[PDB]
Each structure stands twice: as C-alpha cells, then as structure tokens.
Amino acid sequence: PGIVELPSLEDLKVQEVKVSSSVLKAAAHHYGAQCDKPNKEFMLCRWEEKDPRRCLEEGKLVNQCALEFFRQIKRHCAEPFTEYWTCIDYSGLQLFRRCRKEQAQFDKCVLDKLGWVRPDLGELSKVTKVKTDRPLPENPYHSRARPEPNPEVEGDLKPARHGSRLFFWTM
Amino acid sequence: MSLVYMNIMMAFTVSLTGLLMYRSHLMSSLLCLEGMMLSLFILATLMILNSHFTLASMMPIILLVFAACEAALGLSLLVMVSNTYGTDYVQNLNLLQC
Amino acid sequence: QAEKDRRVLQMLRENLEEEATIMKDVPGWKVGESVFHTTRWVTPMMGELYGLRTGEEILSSTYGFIWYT
Amino acid sequence: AKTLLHQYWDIPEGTECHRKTYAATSIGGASGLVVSAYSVALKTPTSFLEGVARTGRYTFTAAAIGAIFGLTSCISAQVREKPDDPLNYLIGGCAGGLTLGARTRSYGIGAAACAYMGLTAALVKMGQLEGWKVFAEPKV
Amino acid sequence: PFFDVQKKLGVDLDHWMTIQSAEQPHRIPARCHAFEKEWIECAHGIGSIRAEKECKIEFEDFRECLLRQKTMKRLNAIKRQRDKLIKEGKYTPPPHHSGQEDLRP
Amino acid sequence: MMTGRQARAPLQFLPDEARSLPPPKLTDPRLAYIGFLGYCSGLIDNAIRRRPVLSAGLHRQFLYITSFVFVGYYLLKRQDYMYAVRDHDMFSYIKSHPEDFPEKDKKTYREVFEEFHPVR
Amino acid sequence: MMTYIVFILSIIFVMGFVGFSSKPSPIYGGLGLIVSGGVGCGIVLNFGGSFLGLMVFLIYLGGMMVVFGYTTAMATEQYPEVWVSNKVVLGTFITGLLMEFLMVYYVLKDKEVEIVFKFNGMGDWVIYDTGDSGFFSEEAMGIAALYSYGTWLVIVTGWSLLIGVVVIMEITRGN
Amino acid sequence: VAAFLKNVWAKEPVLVASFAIAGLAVILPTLSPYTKYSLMINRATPYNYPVPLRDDGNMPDVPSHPQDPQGPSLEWLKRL
Amino acid sequence: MNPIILIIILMTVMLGTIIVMISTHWLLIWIGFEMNMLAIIPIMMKKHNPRATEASTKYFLTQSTASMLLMMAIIINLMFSGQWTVMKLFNPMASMLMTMALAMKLGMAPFHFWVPEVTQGIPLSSGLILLTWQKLAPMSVLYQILPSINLDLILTLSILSITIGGWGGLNQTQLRKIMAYSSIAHMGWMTAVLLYNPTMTLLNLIIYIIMTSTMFTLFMANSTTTTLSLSHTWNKAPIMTILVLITLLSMGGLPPLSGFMPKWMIIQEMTKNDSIILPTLMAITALLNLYFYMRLTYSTALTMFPSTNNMKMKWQFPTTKRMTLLPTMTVLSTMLLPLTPILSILE
Amino acid sequence: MNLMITLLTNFTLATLLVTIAFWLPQLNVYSEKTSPYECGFDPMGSARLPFSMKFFLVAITFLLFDLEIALLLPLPWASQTTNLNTMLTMALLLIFLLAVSLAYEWTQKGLEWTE
Numbered sequence A: 001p002g003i004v005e006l007p008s009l010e011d012l013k014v015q016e017v018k019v020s021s022s023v024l025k026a027a028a029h030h031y032g033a034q035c036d037k038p039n040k041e042f043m044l045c046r047w048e049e050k051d052p053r054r055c056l057e058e059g060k061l062v063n064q065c066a067l068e069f070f071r072q073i074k075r076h077c078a079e080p081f082t083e084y085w086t087c088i089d090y091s092g093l094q095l096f097r098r099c100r101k102e103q104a105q106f107d108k109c110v111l112d113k114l115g116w117v118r119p120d121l122g123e124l125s126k127v128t129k130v131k132t133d134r135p136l137p138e139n140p141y142h143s144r145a146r147p148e149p150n151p152e153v154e155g156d157l158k159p160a161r162h163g164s165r166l167f168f169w170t171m
Numbered sequence B: 001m002s003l004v005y006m007n008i009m010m011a012f013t014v015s016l017t018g019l020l021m022y023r024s025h026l027m028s029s030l031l032c033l034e035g036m037m038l039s040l041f042i043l044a045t046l047m048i049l050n051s052h053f054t055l056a057s058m059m060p061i062i063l064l065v066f067a068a069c070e071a072a073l074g075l076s077l078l079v080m081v082s083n084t085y086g087t088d089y090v091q092n093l094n095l096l097q098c
Numbered sequence C: 001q002a003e004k005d006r007r008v009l010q011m012l013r014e015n016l017e018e019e020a021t022i023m024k025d026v027p028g029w030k031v032g033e034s035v036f037h038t039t040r041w042v043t044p045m046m047g048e049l050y051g052l053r054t055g056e057e058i059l060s061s062t063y064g065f066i067w068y069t
Numbered sequence D: 001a002k003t004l005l006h007q008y009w010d011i012p013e014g015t016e017c018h019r020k021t022y023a024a025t026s027i028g029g030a031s032g033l034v035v036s037a038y039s040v041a042l043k044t045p046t047s048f049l050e051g052v053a054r055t056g057r058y059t060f061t062a063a064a065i066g067a068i069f070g071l072t073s074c075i076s077a078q079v080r081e082k083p084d085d086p087l088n089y090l091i092g093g094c095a096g097g098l099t100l101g102a103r104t105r106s107y108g109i110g111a112a113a114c115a116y117m118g119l120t121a122a123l124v125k126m127g128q129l130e131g132w133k134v135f136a137e138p139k140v
Numbered sequence E: 001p002f003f004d005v006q007k008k009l010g011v012d013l014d015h016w017m018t019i020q021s022a023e024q025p026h027r028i029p030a031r032c033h034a035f036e037k038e039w040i041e042c043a044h045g046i047g048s049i050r051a052e053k054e055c056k057i058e059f060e061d062f063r064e065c066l067l068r069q070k071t072m073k074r075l076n077a078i079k080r081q082r083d084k085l086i087k088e089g090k091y092t093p094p095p096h097h098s099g100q101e102d103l104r105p
Numbered sequence F: 001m002m003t004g005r006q007a008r009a010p011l012q013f014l015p016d017e018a019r020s021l022p023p024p025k026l027t028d029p030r031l032a033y034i035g036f037l038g039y040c041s042g043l044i045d046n047a048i049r050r051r052p053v054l055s056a057g058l059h060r061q062f063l064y065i066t067s068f069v070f071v072g073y074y075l076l077k078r079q080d081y082m083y084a085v086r087d088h089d090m091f092s093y094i095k096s097h098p099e100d101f102p103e104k105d106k107k108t109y110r111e112v113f114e115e116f117h118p119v120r
Numbered sequence G: 001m002m003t004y005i006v007f008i009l010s011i012i013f014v015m016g017f018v019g020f021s022s023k024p025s026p027i028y029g030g031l032g033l034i035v036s037g038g039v040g041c042g043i044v045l046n047f048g049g050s051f052l053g054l055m056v057f058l059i060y061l062g063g064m065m066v067v068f069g070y071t072t073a074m075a076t077e078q079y080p081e082v083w084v085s086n087k088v089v090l091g092t093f094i095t096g097l098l099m100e101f102l103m104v105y106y107v108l109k110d111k112e113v114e115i116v117f118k119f120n121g122m123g124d125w126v127i128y129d130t131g132d133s134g135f136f137s138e139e140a141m142g143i144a145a146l147y148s149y150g151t152w153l154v155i156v157t158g159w160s161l162l163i164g165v166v167v168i169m170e171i172t173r174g175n
Numbered sequence H: 001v002a003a004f005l006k007n008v009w010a011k012e013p014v015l016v017a018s019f020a021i022a023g024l025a026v027i028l029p030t031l032s033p034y035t036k037y038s039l040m041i042n043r044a045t046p047y048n049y050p051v052p053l054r055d056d057g058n059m060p061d062v063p064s065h066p067q068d069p070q071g072p073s074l075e076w077l078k079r080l
Numbered sequence I: 001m002n003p004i005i006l007i008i009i010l011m012t013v014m015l016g017t018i019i020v021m022i023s024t025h026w027l028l029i030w031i032g033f034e035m036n037m038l039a040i041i042p043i044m045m046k047k048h049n050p051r052a053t054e055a056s057t058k059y060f061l062t063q064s065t066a067s068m069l070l071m072m073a074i075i076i077n078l079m080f081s082g083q084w085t086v087m088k089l090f091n092p093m094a095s096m097l098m099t100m101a102l103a104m105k106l107g108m109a110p111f112h113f114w115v116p117e118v119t120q121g122i123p124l125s126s127g128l129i130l131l132t133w134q135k136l137a138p139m140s141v142l143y144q145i146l147p148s149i150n151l152d153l154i155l156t157l158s159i160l161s162i163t164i165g166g167w168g169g170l171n172q173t174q175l176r177k178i179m180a181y182s183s184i185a186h187m188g189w190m191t192a193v194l195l196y197n198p199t200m201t202l203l204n205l206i207i208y209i210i211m212t213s214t215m216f217t218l219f220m221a222n223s224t225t226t227t228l229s230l231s232h233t234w235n236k237a238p239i240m241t242i243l244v245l246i247t248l249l250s251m252g253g254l255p256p257l258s259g260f261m262p263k264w265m266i267i268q269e270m271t272k273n274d275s276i277i278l279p280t281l282m283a284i285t286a287l288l289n290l291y292f293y294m295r296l297t298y299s300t301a302l303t304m305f306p307s308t309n310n311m312k313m314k315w316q317f318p319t320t321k322r323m324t325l326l327p328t329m330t331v332l333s334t335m336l337l338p339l340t341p342i343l344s345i346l347e
Numbered sequence J: 001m002n003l004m005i006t007l008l009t010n011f012t013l014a015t016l017l018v019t020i021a022f023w024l025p026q027l028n029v030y031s032e033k034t035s036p037y038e039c040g041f042d043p044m045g046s047a048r049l050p051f052s053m054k055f056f057l058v059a060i061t062f063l064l065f066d067l068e069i070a071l072l073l074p075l076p077w078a079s080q081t082t083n084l085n086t087m088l089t090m091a092l093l094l095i096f097l098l099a100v101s102l103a104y105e106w107t108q109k110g111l112e113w114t115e
C-alpha cells in the first residue's frame, strides 16, 4: 500500500554523549535542573508529533546541551565528580543512599564554583509549560474523513394508522 | 499468525480428541479436560503478552481459577460413583437408558 | 529517548539500504514497501530491525533481559 | 461436500454419462461414509471386522444408489432428448428405489422407495429450474 | 434479551477492560493503541453493517498491526532470498550486520 | 429489530415519547378480554382446590381481575407505543429516501392489456 | 537451532500432551501433563511472564497432587498400565507423536502450514517489543489493578469460590 | 456479655484472639489519621514521565522551571 | 436439603443467569455460565440416588466440553479482534466453536444425547428448573452474536433438532423423555427463525417456557411420572384431566389455542424471506409431535383407564400441595391467541 | 539461560549418584530379596486395593483454599495503587470470604473425619 519515508543516514550522524550509566546517574539531578528547557521542548514535540522522523532537531539540541553541561562539569569539578561516580558505580543497584559523603562534596563544590542548586524531592516531577513556536498538529494520527452518521429521529409520535395492521386484527 | 500459536492450538485439539474418545475411566477424562484448559490458559497468556494488553492480565489466572472451581467438582462427582459402584468405569455408567 | 529514536531510525535505514542490493532480479517487487494503508509511524517489531543480523545479537537482545539471571 | 454437488450441477444434464454417474457415486459414497460412521458411533460393532463390514455395506449400498440414479437420469435424458424435464429424474428415482429394494432384499420397500425418492428427485429438478432455496438468505 | 443494566443504573462493571484502548494503570499503551482508536472512532454509532462496509481499511490496518503476518511474509521472502544467494555464492554480508559495528551510543 | 431505537436509553417500559400517545380507554375490548381471562383464572382456582366455583373467595377473584387488568393495560400501552414507533420510523425513512422508492402512474383500464381465458 | 527455544519448548509441550492424552492411568497422565505444564511455564517465563508461569506451576502442582491422592484413594485398578501394557494406549500415543512430527516436518520445510488458519515457521521473538517499560513490569500492575479496577470480577470470583465450597460440601452428604 | 466472653476465652482463646484482631483491623483504618497521608504518598510517586503542555499564555499555576515556587511541592513528606 | 442453603443455591443460579444477561464482556459471560453450572449441579442431587449421580455426571461432562469450546472461541475472537465486546464475531471458526458450544449447552441435535437421560434421572422440580432456566442464557448469547452466525449451520441444526425430537418422542413411555424430546422440537422451531427475526425467537421461547412450566406444575400436582399413573389421575380428579387435555392440546399446535400463536407466525417471518419448503417440513414434523401428544392425551383424559381400590382413601383428603400460579400459567398457555399482537412488547 | 545450566548440572549430579550406586557394586538377586516387605510374612492381597480414605473433602478444600491464596497473592503490588480505599475494603472482603468458608466448614462438621 503506502511507502515509508526514512531520513538519510547523514542527518542521523551526530556525535554522542559517550558515558556510562553511573556517570549519567551521578550528575542526573544537576542535568535535570540546568538543562530543563531543551529536554522539555524535545519531550513536548515528541509527545505531540508521535513521529521520530520529524523529531530530530530537538534531540540534536538536547544531545548538544547535555554534552555542553558535561563539559562545564569537566572544566571545574572533575576529581570530586570522578570520586562520586566511582563510588556510585561500585554499588550493584546504583543506590543513592550509599554515597552520602561523595554527594555532599560534589554538591558543595559545584555550588561554590558554579552556583547550581540541587532540586529537592519531587521538584523534577512537576508538570511544566514550554514557550515553543511550532504549530499544533491538527491531524497527528494521519487519519481520514469520518463516515457520515445515520440521521436521528425527529417529529411527534403520531399514532399507528388503523391499528397494528396485523392480519385481521383491527386494533 | 505464528508457530507457538499453532503448537498450542494443536495441543488443545489433541487433548480434545483425547477427551472425546473415552478409555473407560472418568478421571482420565478429567485430566484431559484440565489439559484442554492448560492449552487455553497458555494461549491466552501468550496472546496477551505479545499484544502488551496489561489490564486484561487478570483474565488468564481468573480463567485458571474458575477451572479449578469446576475441576474439584468433577472430583466431587467421582467418589459418589465410588460410593455406589466399586470402580469408576464409564461402561458401568449405563443405568439411565430406560 | 533521543538516543533510542536515532538508533531506531539508523537501524531501519541500514535494513532498507541493503534490501535494494539483494532483491533486484526478482520480478514485480517494490523495495521498502510498507504493509500499512496509512503513512503514520508505527513502532517497529523486532524482526524488522535485527532480521538481517547475526543470531548472537538475537539471543543477546531479545531474550537477553530475561536470561540475565 | 460443497464442491461435489456443484460439480454434479456444473455439467449439462443428459450430455455426458460417466462423469455424472461418478459424481453421483461420489456423493453417495460421502453420504454412506457419514451414515456408517454414525451407525458405528451410536451402535457398538461387536468386532473391528464386523464394523468395517457394516461400513463397506453402507458405502456399497449408497454408491450403487447414486450410480444407478445418475446413470438412469443420463440415459433417460439422452433417449427422450429433454434436459429440462423432471420425468427423467422420477425414472431415476424409481431406479434407485429398485436398487434399494434389491440391496435390502425387499419389494414393498422398493416400491415405496420408487415413489419417495422419485418425488424427491422431481422436487430437486423443479427446485433447480424454478430457483427455489432450501436455506433462504435473510432479506427483510 | 441483552438487558444492559450497566447504563440503566449508571454503574461501570466491565467497560473498563473490554477494549484494548481503554484507561490503563499508570498510563501504559498497548501495541496497537492508535489503530484501536481509529477503528473505534471511525465505526462509532453508524451500525455494524455500515462499519464493515465502510471502515474496512482501518480495521485491516489494525489486524495487520496485531497479527503482523504480512511483515512475516515479507521477512520470510527476503530471508529465503538471502539464504539462496548465500547458498549459490553471490552475496557477502557487511561488517555492520556481522556484528563488529560499534553501535550508536 | 427495533433494538437500535432501544439502544441509547435502555430498560424503559414507557419512554417520554409514550406519554404523547392516546392511552387505551378502559372500555377497550382487549382490556375486557384480559379481565375475562382473570375471571377464568379465578374460576380455575375455585375448581382445582375443591371449592364451590361461583361463590367461594370473591376477594381472590377480584384480586385476579384487578391484577390481570393492570398488567394488560400496561402491556397494551407498550404495544401501541411500539406500533406507533414502527409507523413513525416507516414514514421518516420514506420521507428520507425518495430516490430508491419512486412514484407509480396508475393506468386506466382502457389501455392496459389483459388476457381473457374462456371457461367452457 | 538456538533461537528456536520457544519452538523446542512448544514441541515438548505437544509431546507431553500426546503422551498423557492416551489416558493410560491417572498417575502417568498426571506425570505427562506435569511435564507439559513445566515446559509451558518455561514458555511463559521465556516470554517475560514470571508471575503467570509460576502461578500456573503452583496451581497445577496442588491440583494434581490432589488428583494423585484421589487416584490412589478410589480410582485404582489391580494392574495399572504404564504405556505399553495395553495396545490402544501405545497405538494412540505413537499415532499422536507421528502427527506431531508430521507438522514438525511440515513447518520446518515450507515455513508456512495451513491448518484451519495459516501458520509461520519463525520464532515468536520477532513480534516481541523493542521498547522499554521503565522501572516496572506491566503484568504486575495488571494483577495490582485486579483489586482497584477489578471490582465486579473479584466479587463474582470470590462468590463463585464460596459457592464451590458450599456445593462441594452439599454434594457428598449422602442423606 | 462478660460470662459468654469468659466462656469462649476459657474454651478456645485462639478464636477470641482471631476475632479481636479481625475487629481491630476492620474498625481501626476507618479511625486512622494517616490514611490520607498514605493516599498522597502513593499519589506522589513519579512513575511515568511528567510531560509538559502547550501554552496559550493563560496559566497561573504551572511553572516554566522545576525550581519555580509555582506548582505543587512535597514539603509534607520531607518533614512528616 | 437445608432451606437457607437451597435459597442461596437458587440465588446463585439466578445471579449467574443475570450476569450472562447484563455483561458486555466475554469473560463475565463465561463466569456467569460457570456459576450457572455450579449452582444447577446440586439441584439434581437433592435426593441422593444413583440415577441422579449418573445424570449429574453426564450433564457436567457435556457442559464442561461446551464451556471449553466457548473459551476457545472467545480466545480466537480475541486474537483476531483484540477486544472483548459482546457483539458480532470476527472469525468464522470462532463462530463455529461458539455455535457448537451453545448447541451443546442447549441440547440441540445431534448434541441431544444428554437431555433425555438428564431429565429422566432428576425429579420434576429439577427438570422444570433445567428445561426452563437453562434455555435463557444461551438464547441471549445467540441473540448477541446473530450477525456472525452461519446460516446453513443453524438451519441444519434446527431441522435436525425438530426431526430428531419428533422421532424420539414417538417411542417413549416415560413422561420426562417425552418432555426432553418435545423440548428439542421446540428448540429447533425456536432457533430456525433466529436469523430472520429474533423477536419471533423470544416470543416462541416465552410461550414454550410458559407451557412447559404449566405441564411440569401439573405433573408435580398429580405427583405422576408415568403414563399409567397419569391415566389413573382420572379417578382422583376430573379437573386435572380437563387441564392436562387442554394444555397438551395447546402444545400440539391447534387453533384457537396459544400454541398455534408462535409457530404460525414463524412462517409469517419465513415466507417474507421466500423460504417455503422449510416451514412446510417443520410443520410436518410438528404434526409428528402432535401425534405423540395425541397418543398421550388418549392415555390420560379422553379414555378413563381402570383404577385400583386404594384411591378411595385419596378421596378423603384434598390436595394440600402448593400449585405455584397454576391457573394463570394454564390460562396463558391456553387462550393467548386473541392477544396475538402483544409480541410487539418484545421489540 | 543460567537457570537452565543450573537445572542441567543438578540433574547430572543427581543421576550420576544412582548410576554409581547401581553399576559399581556386585549384584546377586534371588526370588526372595525382590519380594515385597510385609514384616516377614506374605502380603495379604495387593496394595492396589482402593483405600477408604477419609479426608477427600479436606483435599478438595485444600485445592479451593489454594485458589483463595492465588486470589490473595498479588496483594503487595496493590499496595502501590492510588485507590487505597477499594483495595483495603476488598482485600478485607476476600479474607472475610475465606473465613466464611472456613466457618461454614467448622459448623457443618467438615473439618472432622469420617467413620
């Protein structure tokens, strides 16, 4: 029936945040605090477009801003961050409980030298709004014209003509 | 559709031909009935797990549950025969013919 | 999420771009043809992605989560 | 069994003999297998050999019924040169009735069978001619 | 006598589970949520006969989403062609498909 | 086959449109017949329990007559409501679709040909 | 022949079903069905259904431990047949195994059999998802919303089990 | 009712203890003060993603940043 | 049987029937069917007799096979359709399996091999409950899925049911086997018209239920389960002979009785679809049913059989049994013809 | 996969011990060492006679109570649900149904033994 329209491999060729799970988890709160705008833009346009072939620029900007944030982490607070993600990575379940001293040192260093505040419990789980400019897709599901419904019933209920009209029954 | 679907439905009809052709014992037929229900349960669970239908996940186990709620009844319909006949052969179960 | 969408599009493009070089002499086939009447994006099943790769990736990706203890 | 009846009615009547006769024989054989399977199902045969003897008996009787019916219809429609006449089917029905009386070893059964499936064959023929429906599709 | 008392008393007994595109716990979509939505909304209130006669395309797309059988035939055809071309000997797999490929992240 | 009409609003014995119809009069012959049915039922109770048939238990006969008349009146109301619904849907569809049901020009007998078969 | 693990488990399922469908004796039929239920539970675990597979395992173990107790209680013959002590049991077991291998050879050769519906020869893993469900399993919230969303279903299930108890009490009274 | 209670406590204390525990488990959550705390604790767990919304310009409640004071906080469980 | 436990059992079977009536889900339909099974099972074992155990075993096995076929049909419909709404089915094989399940549950031929033994092995009240209340839920399910019902299958099952019921009723002396084969004949008459106008099916079901309940109430009142005792009822009371004569004339299909009301209008909804020979054949088999009915009426009422000397004692005590709404159901079973258009209340 | 390896290793170690226990020592059998054990005398009949077992209802109701367990078993994940009132009310209802079945068994003389 239809044909698929796939993007070229050149457009998808973009450098990546080549890090691990524990490194991403160690700086997760500060990444969610500082870099909320491009991430929320990407999440909103992905939720309202439902098509990854049209959702590439916001993902590119999310990736670039994430790598910029990690570069800013690397320039100022490298060694406490290395200690933090190392002791995070030692634990099997990646528990935030077994890393209190390293987390305290990391947040103190990044607050004193970069002024980022770690969000409290539930602050990252709030619903937000995004000052976007893309138009609202009026037909996001690629549907077609709906069939015409049946006409309703109109008019008064006049009585039956000459009774039931069933065989010899007059009434 | 697939392959495991074919295997499970063929197991169901194999157990159906096992039940529908008796071999002179009631409880063996009860075992074949529970086998047919096993094929039904396996098919339903696999169908749900392929289709990601989360909220219908109650239906297999409950189906399973209700089967036991009749299967014990079949066992409760065995010893009563054993309380009248010495054994539970179906060829002895022909009193209702007059 | 961005990584997952970019990887899915990359794998689908890799599968489509090698479908052309294998099926040429066959008659009456249009390459890359979809089986859906609508042009809307669908979440691809696992056979469309890794249906041309080696089997080690198959048991490390399909059953890999379940078989990891 | 939806193709046996249609293949019976896919050939013009009284034109070719052996194909129509074999089609009617196959329909009779299917009916005989059905009735013999039911007979060995509800009634237990005393042995395997007696059961397959009963199955072969019913198969042979019904196959002879169908073969003689189709044959007699074929030569009747060929001799009278009337394809659209149910009298050929009535004659074939009496031929089948005589066949049933011969295989069952009776005479009054043969005459009653003459009348009964001769009328049945005639009803089939004007059902085909006038387009009657045994299972009418819902219209209103 | 389908006595629909679920609408007479206004009590929801089993309308919350009967359809794949219903409200799900923790908002988890099924594998064919959009196709279910299209098939329901196209074939709503116009009758079953008109729904079958007119809304056949979206129901066919939904059935293809569920069973995926046409994709199975496609994969079978390309895999039989691949096995044949390996067996005669005019095909070589690329390093990306063979495993040594260094995936995107 | 009226189930679609009983699709949106169910388990209603007499809907809002049924009140706009003329109710059956108490002198309707069908109501009298149903009252006779109740009287016969009371006579059958006087018969089968070995009682006098025409005098025993006037309260039972009056209860039977009243109950039969009550359920007969309500069933007749539902019946004429359903028949009025049938005729109204009839006329609505026959206004709605004139292309599939055209008009007929009734010819006179001075030109329509008929074949006369003599009886002799 | 590695990624056909679901196919192999289904073949053992059909083999055990043919084995206990001969109806030789309730203990041996229970053994055959228990092997079949073990590989069916293996199928469900291999499809991610940990809870459903373990539940069908535990339920079947309890139910046919009761069945074992019943066949050792009442329904016993003097010389039970294993599989070969009688002729028709072995005949129908060999027959069922032959048809099982018949569509095995039919599905590994043309990869598309037609028995009522049409069936393919690839493993079911091709239909399994490519997406991740986060920090949770979906069937767990299915059986969790069993109590919240499932009001009428749980009510009728509990009432039916209570009625089963009272019925089973009433049946074996005698007087 | 004291004599009957003493009688069942003397005959079988297990039934008396079981019925006391059952009655406590029935009537105490209906008198509990922390049930609504459990309600908001269960409701406040962030399982799925909190997707944002489109903007028409008229919303006083939702924020543009997670650290903005507008929006719901979670101070009650932090103190408790 | 304990009265409270019996009341709970009756509330369970009516609750299962109501659940099948009101549910819009296939699983709840099957749950109601299972509750119906599990509640009707001890009704047959109220007397604790070996005949009751044989009947219960046969009924339980047949209904279990029907339930498993119903579940397989439901799962096939789910897999090809993805939902659970009680509406038209999306597969012919699921329609086959559900039609076989409902035919097995109803007792329609050739699955009629369990109804006469089950009716014979149980008492009269249990037979009433069976032959009346088990014919409501499968009729509702067939009412729900009539778009997907194959025409040839249901028509073949109907004509086989009527022919087999008449031929079975020609050669039975017991009253309960007569009732079972008459129920098969009425089932075929009722399900032949299902695809053309289901209101005719509902009307014939209502009339059949009223007449069968009337006859079983008369049999309970006379405490008779044999033809000879039914003939002996003439000496005990003449009024009982009058009512058995008029009722068994009503179920024959004679005007102006109420039993001519459904069947005739069945033809009125089958000649509109230009099906002519099928109502004629079913009328001929209705004449066969009328023949065994006429033999039974000759046995009981029109000829007074010789009696014994013991019945004089029974002349000194009136009938103290409770006849539940007997005159109303007799009147509705006899003289409902002049109120024929009342079937329009079933739309 | 690791579960399969553990199962195969356990079965291999189990079936290797009986093979070592059987084919290693010297066998010497007559028609008395293979005889059934009846405390030094011949057995009276066979052991395949039907036992007049007395806890048939207890086994069936064990099955039914195990299905009650199957209904009550997914309760911990229901602790994470939002609608807590319906959860608590119906968990209490199902436990009460279990207790009602047990109490009816207690009153109507079901937990005791036959004969």
Ligand SMILES: CCCCCCCCCCCCCCCCCC(=O)OC[C@H](COP(=O)([O-])OCC[N+](C)(C)C)OC(=O)CCCCCCCCCCCCCCCCC
Pocket (backbone or CB within 6 Å): H011, H012, H013, H014, H017, H020, H021, H024
């Ligand atoms: C796991 C950690 C270690 C555990 C301890 C291990 C070391 C000790 C082992 C001791 C020996 C055990 C084996 C031998 C005994 C075996 C038989 C047996 O156990 O029988 C059970 C015995 C049997 O009783 P019985 O044998 O006396 O039965 C007689 C019954 N009547 C009186 C009716 C005739 O007890 C029970 O069944 C009771 C169950 C346990 C009770 C626990 C109560 C806890 C507190 C409840 C609340 C109390 C306050 C009041 C209510 C307040 C409400 C708010």
